[PDB]
Amino acid sequence: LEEAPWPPPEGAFVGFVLSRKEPMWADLLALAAARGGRVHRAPEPYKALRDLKEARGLLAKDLSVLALREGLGLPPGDDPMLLAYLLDPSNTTPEGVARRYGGEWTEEAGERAALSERLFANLWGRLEGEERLLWLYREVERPLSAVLAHMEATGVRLDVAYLRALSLEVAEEIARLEAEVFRLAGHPFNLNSRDQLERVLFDELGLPAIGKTEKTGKRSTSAAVLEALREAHPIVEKILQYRELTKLKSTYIDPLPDLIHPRTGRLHTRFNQTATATGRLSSSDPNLQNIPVRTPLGQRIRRAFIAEEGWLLVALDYSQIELRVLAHLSGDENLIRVFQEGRDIHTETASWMFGVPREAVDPLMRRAAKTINFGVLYGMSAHRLSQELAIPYEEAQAFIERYFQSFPKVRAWIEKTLEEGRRRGYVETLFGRRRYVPDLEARVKSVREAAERMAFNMPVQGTAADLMKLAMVKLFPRLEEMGARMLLQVHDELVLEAPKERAEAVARLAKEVMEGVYPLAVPLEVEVGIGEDWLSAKE
DNA sequence: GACCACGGCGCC
DNA sequence: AAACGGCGCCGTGGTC
Ligand SMILES: Nc1nc2c(ncn2[C@H]2C[C@H](O)[C@@H](COP(=O)(O)OP(=O)(O)OP(=O)(O)O)O2)c(=O)[nH]1
Ligand SMILES: [Mg+2]
Ligand SMILES: [Mg+2]
Ligand SMILES: [Mg+2]
After folding, report:
1. Which residues touch strand B (CB under 7 A)?
2. Region labeled Polymerase — which residues?
3. What is the rounded CA–CA span in Å between residue A536 and residue A526?
């Protein structure tokens, strides 16, 4: 290309280099742009940011987040990663995308700009006549990228002092548990080392090894296995409790307070838009889509996520989402009628399986039932259903029997989905998002049947993901008008921040936007709550 | 110090 | 072991 002075013209493709991957923490090392046979390099990249009307190019969202951190409204536009990801969701990194579609991902802003221009041209070529993928790009993925940039840059308020205090107390309890483990072992060891634990449990003590590890074939010490040995030694109980405490302490309690950004005062995740095989988002650096919720300590941790003073959190979660999506995709008359009557399958399974009235069904129980409903649907074995439910074998075969043909056309849709996948090489969501599943005609049954369960899950998980993304796209400008913020997405859930005076209005409107995003043959329902913290906002 | 594979486990 | 699906992070044991 011709080297031309900085500033590029309207609509050039950007390239940039960050000191590190996290846009909120990164130094912008270099910036450049490409257009009309010219390349333009910024002499000082922070100043040069102000010249651009949009970030158009590879990883556009990340540059926009960094721009927003600097008080600049620089929205992300076209991004070839999104085109590639829609062509094939195994396109997840610029390294792979570059090499597949006609360049090389280097460490020089100018080359990255030139690469972005030609990859766009090429990937746009590959999408000619792909009307549905084009619809998803223009109506979902491209505008979603601007919403995620705003979410990332806003971050969430964390109660830091509280988490520090909690750490000091959890440490004393951890030392009580490990002292007693060491007393039962007859000696100390590194209890965090699963290899050392293996030796202690199965070689030194008498315990039977009920399982091997996948890749290396060691005797397993997972909670599944240790559940089996709960009565067979007291020590196991102590280990499981230690595991829980150390997991929560090392993953959330200790790292999160150290991630508060000094300028914003807030905690900033990244929402990765080309990371999953199904069209879902992921969250990283720190993952805020797996904050504990389940155990009493998990609940304590979740209370650390709070509203700014004068604001409240609003938490919205889709009811029974993939079950509703299934009703629509399959067209099953019985499953449709179940949601038309306002039934709750999760509560009904809990009630059945624990043998209590619905009124007594607690959150712990509801989660257990989810495992069963989604397990069975997505091809769980009779054997593994027996384990889990803790019941005989032929009963599980009959349960899986009872589950299907209660909903006869689910099976017919599973079969239809697999034959299209075998013939075309890919399966698709309601909106035409594709996933290529190559192993459907594999000759090794295990490899074939795993490919099958991945294949028929994707249209269901992926359609739910499509719906949520579209709701976000529709909701965001409505929130801006009302002076509220979108903070987090957790697959079928949004967490917003609203000024106290507008909180109820905001909750009502977001609920409606989420429920009416794309009408199906069953109603979507959204549970919404409002509170000072994330836990209290879902009660 | 970075990177890796693995087991294990938090959430959806 | 259990072969529901989709993720990312931790502490290991280990290499370079
Ligand atoms: N295959 C599978 N999918 C799951 C599992 N847990 C959650 N999901 C998927 C399916 C759910 O519909 C979706 C949203 O998770 P939620 O915790 O919100 O469950 P759901 O919305 O169905 O129930 P809810 O009515 O919100 O309590 O994520 C699981 O254990 N297996
Ligand atoms: Mg839900
Ligand atoms: Mg949810
Ligand atoms: Mg792994």
Report:
1. A 194, 198, 213-218, 220-224, 226, 240, 243-244, 247-248, 251, 287, 289-295, 298, 367, 490-493
2. 117-539
3. 17
Q: Residue A62: phi, psi to the nearest 5?
A: -60, -40
What is d(CA A406, CA A419) in angstroms, rounded to the nearest whole number?
A: 23
Residue bearing tokens 């926009």: A64
Six token digits for residue A449: 């049947």
Phi and psi based region of residue A434 (left: phi greater than 0; alpha: psi -120 to 50; beta: remaining) = beta
Q: How far apart are the first and last CA of chain A?
A: 59
Pocket lining: A370 vs ligand 1, CB cutoff 6 Å: yes
Cβ proximity of A51 and A39 under 8 Å? no
Four-residue CA torsion sign, A10, A14, A19, A20: positive
Residues 6 or more apart in contact with residue A402 via CB below 8 angstroms: none
Question: What single letter denotes the amino acid at residue A20?
Answer: R
Nucleotide nearest to A374 (CA to C1'): C4
Which residue has a Cα nearest atom 8 of ligand 1? A374
The resolution in angstroms reads 2.1
Residue A77: HSE in the Cβ half-sphere, 13 Å Cα cutoff: 16
Distance from C-alpha of A434 to C-alpha of A125, rounded to nearest angstrom: 18
> Closest nucleotide (CA of A298 to C1')?
B10
Q: For residue A219, which nucleotide's C1' is closest to its Cα?
A: C1
> What are the Cα distances from residue A342, in Å, to A319, A337, A356, A467?
11, 9, 20, 20
Distance CA A82, CA A397 (A): 43
User: Is A325 near ligand 1, meaning CB less than 6 Å away?
Assistant: no
* Span from the CA of A317 to the centroid of ligand 3 (angstroms): 5
Residues 179-198 in A having a C-beta less than 7 A from any atom of strand C are 190, 192-196
Spatial CB neighbours of A302, under 8 Å, sequence gap ≥ 6 = A291, A292, A293, A533, A534, A535
Residue A180 phi, psi (nearest 5): -70, -35
Rounded to whole angstroms, how far apart are CA atoms A386 and A314? 39
Biggest CA pair distance of chain A: 75
Q: Please report, rounded to whole angstroms, the spatial distance between the CA atom of protein residue A443 and the C1' atom of nucleotide C13.
A: 36
With tokens 């559940």, the residue in question is: A227
User: Which domains does chain A show, CATH number per domain?
Assistant: 1-153 (3.30.420.10), 154-270 (1.20.1060.10), 271-320+465-538 (3.30.70.370), 321-464 (no CATH)
Structure tokens at A516: 């009416």
Identify the bridge partners of residue A135 per DSSP, sorted by sequence position. none
Helix (H) or strand (E) holding A427: strand A426-428
**Tell me, in Å, how far CA of A140 is from C1' of C9?**
29
Q: Mind giving me the DSSP string for A4-30?
A: E-S---TTPEEEEEESSS-TTT--EEE
Q: How far is the CA of A429 from the centre of ligand 2 (A)?
A: 19
Distance A214 CA to ligand 4 centre (A): 11
